């Protein structure tokens, strides 16, 4: 099917009508998404099939057709862009200065932007257009607002 680089919606017809369960990034022949979007299930691209290749529930990431390819990192200083792909709506870029998730195992960038659950997997980009992580695994803070980690995998 379509193997062109870019951002894609992850759809399903199992529920009422056609429902968007998430989003992903096709790069260097590999499809990258968050684990909670597909639960590791196989995907269809037109008449072709994409099989999972690597996945990890704790990182909440999965790659199809090959190993994880995305290796850019947030520089810790600059604004970034969430290329949000909401259900039933056109892809749109939102610029923001990330906050920080402080963990016992190090610091991670975080974006304080709230979109429907089906937007999970939308890429976060640097000024060179490189994908520095995926949106959709986060927390609800004291205010009640939503903050997503900038989740990035490892390129072997």
């Amino acid at each position: 099917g379509e193997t062109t680089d870019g951002v894609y919606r992850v759809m399903t017809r199992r529920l009422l009508g056609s429902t968007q369960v998430g989003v992903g990034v096709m790069q260097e022949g590999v499809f990258h998404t968050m684990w909670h979007v597909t639960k590791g299930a196989a995907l269809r691209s037109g008449e072709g099939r994409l099989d999972p290749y690597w996945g990890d529930v704790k990182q909440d990431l999965v790659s199809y057709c090959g190993p994880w390819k995305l290796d850019a990192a947030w520089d810790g200083l600059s604004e970034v862009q969430l290329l949000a792909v909401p259900p039933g709506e056109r892809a749109k870029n939102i610029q923001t200065l990330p906050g920080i998730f402080k963990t016992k195992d190090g610091d991670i960038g975080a974006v304080a932007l709230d979109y429907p659950a089906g937007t999970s997997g939308s890429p976060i980009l640097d000024k060179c257009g490189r994908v520095i992580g995926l949106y959709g695994n986060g927390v609800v803070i004291k205010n009640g607002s939503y903050v997503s980690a900038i989740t990035q995998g490892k390129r072997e």
Partner: protein
């Protein structure tokens, strides 16, 4: 049975809408991939 549909190119867009704050939070990540606030 899930399927994928192209939604666009991945590019930085000049003069995009600028919003969102930058909170600094202490968080924990459990074995199930769920983040929680550490207080």
């Amino acid at each position: 049975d899930m399927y994928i549909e192209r939604a666009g190119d991945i590019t930085w867009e000049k003069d995009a809408e600028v919003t969102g704050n930058s909170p600094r939070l202490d968080v924990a990540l459990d074995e199930s991939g769920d983040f929680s606030l550490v207080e």
